[PDB]
């Protein structure tokens, strides 16, 4: 199911908490923001330093029908001054590359060996579909036959403003069969 | 062996309509991605448009807008293309492709290719 | 919309040498998250549609013998073909598949100088 040039980094490891001692009874759980056929995590207010920080902001993105576009915006580092300046996104070379569950632990996935069939274009409306462009968007097929979970990760309890620490942010999509 | 055939040539008079089909054998389409691609006399190849027919979506050149639509019948895996209000410059050779999917895309390995139709606009 | 360009137009060379066509993209075509070039070539023979040679810009299509190389990243392309054969006539095109409008090159006519 991976051609000649699909490459993951094996050695990467991380966790759902990574380093912000949150426990996950403590997750802030929400579901991301449907608008017909489109899902969508915007963590542009979610994430900034506060209080209480560092805090874990969990968007359950739930698929059971067809043909669902979800799209994933992380705030660029820089797009305000200060409050992102230390923010980074796993994986680098989302949504080709996925983070999935292995004995509790976060490591590389292709997307593509997930999901048959899905879509991934390089480009959405003129921009580089990375999150180096801040958002991020891939369209689920018509038939899923193989259940799967995966993950993205947009990290910015690193940054620091004012003696307050910004919130790591958690994309859980869950996809169940469907179209059968 | 997949194979892509293609409806026959046409005459069809300035202003009319077209519709050429073109039926997969070795299975449904259902996971591949068609494009429709024409051939000028003396010119290279121009991209028509495309559908995927698992997905009912397609996408078109600029120049086409308004005149063509692309439809499946899943039922006999045959592909459609019709082009209406139709120009001399029109006369061309259309083929249909297939392409398998990989790595998050439809159209990254068009290696089934239909025989051509010669759709010729003349009175 | 990207602009696909080749060069040169025609090629005429002798049994045994190396041919080299160019493609040039108005756009990079490299989608960096998967690393890979959206680009192929194809081969057409008279009377016959398109033939897929190379895809990715660079793995060959099955039975297309080694001889058949493609090779650039980005923006620039190159199919080399090795060893030139007298089966090996035909009109050479390159395609982008990156986004729509998918374009393909103008191409290069390729015929043996006996």
């Known amino acids: 199911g991976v051609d000649e040039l699909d490459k993951i980094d094996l050695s990467y490891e991380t966790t759902e908490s990574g380093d912000t001692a949150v426990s996950e009874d403590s997750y802030d759980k929400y579901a991301s923001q449907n608008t017909n056929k489109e899902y969508v995590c915007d963590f542009t207010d979610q994430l900034k330093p506060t209080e209480s920080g560092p805090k874990v902001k969990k968007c359950e993105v739930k698929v059971n029908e067809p043909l669902i576009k979800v799209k994933i915006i992380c705030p660029l580092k820089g797009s305000v001054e200060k409050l992102y300046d230390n923010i980074e996104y796993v994986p680098k070379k989302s949504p080709y590359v996925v983070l999935t569950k292995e004995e509790t632990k976060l490591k590389e996935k292709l997307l593509s060996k997930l999901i048959y069939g899905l879509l991934i274009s390089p480009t959405v409306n003129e921009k580089e579909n990375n999150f180096k462009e801040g958002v991020i968007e891939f369209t689920l097929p018509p038939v899923v036959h193989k259940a799967t979970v995966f993950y993205f990760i947009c990290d910015n309890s690193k940054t620091e403003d004012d003696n307050k620490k910004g919130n790591r942010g958690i994309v859980e999509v869950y996809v169940e069969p469907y179209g059968g | 062996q997949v194979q892509l055939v293609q409806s026959g040539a046409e005459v069809k008079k300035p202003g009319s309509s077209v519709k050429v089909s073109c039926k997969a054998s070795?299975?449904?389409?259902?996971?591949?991605?068609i494009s429709w691609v024409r051939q000028a006399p003396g010119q290279g190849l121009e991209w028509v448009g495309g559908?995927?027919?698992?997905?009912?979506?397609?996408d078109y050149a600029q120049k086409f807008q308004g005149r063509v639509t692309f439809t499946t019948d899943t039922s006999t895996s045959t592909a459609y293309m019709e082009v209406s209000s139709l120009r001399s410059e029109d006369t061309a050779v259309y083929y249909c492709?297939?392409?398998?999917?990989?790595?998050?895309?439809?159209?990254?390995?068009?290696?089934?290719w239909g025989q051509g139709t010669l759709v010729t606009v003349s009175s | 919309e990207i602009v696909m360009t080749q060069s040169p137009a025609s090629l005429a060379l002798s049994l045994g040498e190396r041919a080299t066509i160019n493609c040039k993209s108005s756009?990079?075509?490299?989608?960096?998250?998967?690393?890979?070039?959206?680009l192929a070539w194809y081969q057409q023979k008279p009377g016959q549609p398109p033939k897929l040679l190379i895809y990715?810009?660079?793995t060959r299509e099955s039975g297309v013998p080694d001889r058949f190389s493609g090779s650039g990243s980005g923006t620039d392309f190159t199919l080399t073909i090795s060893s030139l054969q007298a089966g090996d006539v035909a009109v050479y095109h390159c395609?982008?598949?990156?986004?729509?409008?998918?374009?393909f090159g103008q191409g290069t006519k390729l015929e043996i100088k006996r």
């Open positions: 070795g299975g449904t389409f259902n996971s591949y991605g």
């Open positions: 395609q982008q598949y990156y986004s729509t409008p998918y374009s």
């Open positions: 990715w810009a660079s």
């Open positions: 492709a297939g392409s398998s999917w990989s790595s998050g895309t439809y159209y990254g390995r068009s290696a089934y």
């Open positions: 559908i995927i027919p698992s997905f009912g979506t397609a």
């Open positions: 756009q990079s075509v490299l989608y960096s998250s998967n690393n890979k070039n959206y």
